[PDB]
Amino acid sequence: GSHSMRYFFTSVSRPGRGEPRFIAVGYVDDTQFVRFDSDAASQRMEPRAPWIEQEGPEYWDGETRKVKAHSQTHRVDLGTLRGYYNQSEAGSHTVQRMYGCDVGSDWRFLRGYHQYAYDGKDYIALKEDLRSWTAADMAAQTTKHKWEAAHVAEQLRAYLEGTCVEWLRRYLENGKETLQRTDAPKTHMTHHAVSDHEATLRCWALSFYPAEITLTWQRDGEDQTQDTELVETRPAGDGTFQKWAAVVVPSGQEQRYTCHVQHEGLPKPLTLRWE
Amino acid sequence: GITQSPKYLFRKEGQNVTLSCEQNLNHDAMYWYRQDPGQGLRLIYYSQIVNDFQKGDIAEGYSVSREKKESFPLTVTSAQKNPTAFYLCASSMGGTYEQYFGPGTRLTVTEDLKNVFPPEVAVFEPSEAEISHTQKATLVCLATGFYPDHVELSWWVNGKEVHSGVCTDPQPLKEQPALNDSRYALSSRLRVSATFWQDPRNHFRCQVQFYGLSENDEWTQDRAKPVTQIVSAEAWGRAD
Amino acid sequence: QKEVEQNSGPLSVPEGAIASLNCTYSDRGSQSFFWYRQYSGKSPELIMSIYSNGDKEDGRFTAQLNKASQYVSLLIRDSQPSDSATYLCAVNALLGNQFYFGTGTSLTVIPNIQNPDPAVYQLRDSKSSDKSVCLFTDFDSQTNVSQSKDSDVYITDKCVLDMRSMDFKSNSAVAWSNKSDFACANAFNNSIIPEDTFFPS
């Protein structure tokens, strides 16, 4: 919807050379504000955004004790899951978990989710109604019946519908200059001679936030999907994103091709030409 | 699956006391509270993981170790100013989940063991006026001059414990409230039918279980040793 | 303030009526709310747990939660003598990963006894036959007793005994002393005697 808050957890086991590595990151929209690394030196929930640093020590001490509990839950998960499939202790396995909430224009609850994966494939996930479970394989049905008898979905819904959207509103207000901003794309176009008859036009879009953007090529006002190349959105590194779309054009008729950039910071999409 | 030992404990001021708490629910978090009479719970210590523990709101004079996941021993030291309290142990799945409490331990620390006394139990027969006016008869039982207030009273009619027609005070009263080491008095009443009291074959007994010094505690006073014992008083029916 | 606040004053409710226990908390990332029941001298027993706004019915008590105005209540239908206990309010805190308790609210249900026959009887010892006690019994619910202003006279609070041989209850209180000139007409003068007692000879 309008805004969202998401957490991402990853636990990869290192059989024979240490305990499993745990990495947790927090995101509000496309901005990372908290992180934790078991291999890091701080051994604490570390801030990654300026507006989250104003939280008191009760926050960080509580968050640090929560991520270590998340890692401790994944340690027994890695051992339990290898027994569900009769897998050896010599193989390195990965456990991933993510949850969060989506809010609307009124900053009220709109959508919630809580997903779990094992070795890169879906294991179990909470449905949209936040009341049922989607077990992937037969070994995942054991977790479902275990979590249904423990009323886990009822308590997860109290977070996704409750403190997730309430603390997302708190972060949006404290970081208004950062989270509620909208950076329009800085666009331009480059020309590259490919052959005697062909030439590629590259439509650039740099320094835009959030990452959602759409680049469309048109010829004489009609969409042209053939002979077009679109790369995935790149994080620039300074909190903004980059993306470009290209098209190969016969030499001389580059005036007929137009680039179109659709972004949140543009009420009407921009049109880019070569000349 | 949470147990505490002992249920009642009595020690002399000047040494350390170890309160035990074993937990079987495979919980990672365990908590120690103390509850003063008429008040709420106050956190002493708690532990999140197997080798960690953090001070509570009142950790002065309290030591706590966590060597294994199932045991959470609380050792109250002589630096504690008021060790006498109702100590409750709890455990939970996590720091934000609901906690389940153990049975509890009533710790009482006094200056010297001279203040320990077993209760004096006496049963009082009903009056002729109550029987003629209401066709009912109430037997009253008094346990007086015991310290501490670790007592459990029960009525036994014809050798079988009864609960119907029984009312006991919720907590015993201090015979001299202005004193810190005052004795305690507790009362109870058993009301039966007038036709039931007038049967000479019915047997009434007021049993009072007292928890005092253990048989292993030293005792140098010439007075009778106030061991954990049972003091009762009997009464038979009377058609008069 | 504390993190969880509730009126610790003793709350009385007639037998069979609805007992309402209120509780307020300070939002520290609170999403789980619980009610514990603790009898005199025993451990708190978890009896209720609510997680979303609205009412949650289980047995004779229902849990009501409102997160907007921070407060969670507990209504008890058909107030029975077994409900007389102090109820502790529990609220979790995702801020700091903590779990907070309230001070507790003592609940004492009062029996709606009809046809009272108040009187103060004297009872002598079954074996000693020289010690005497006084018994203020069969008084209505409105009557209350008070502690004696003398260190030699001992007074106890009210006590509701339930005869299941009959189908009636009766409040009662006992008083005694060692003055050797004690009188059952001078014991309960501190308390409000409801002008309907019967003092025998």
């Binding site: 957490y7 968050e63 929560k66 839950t73 998960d77 977070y159 | 989940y97 | 999403q31």
Partner: peptide, 9 residues
């Protein structure tokens, strides 16, 4: 803020 410590599989 983070959610409670999750249940194990």
């Amino acid at each position: 803020i983070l959610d409670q410590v999750p249940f194990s599989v």
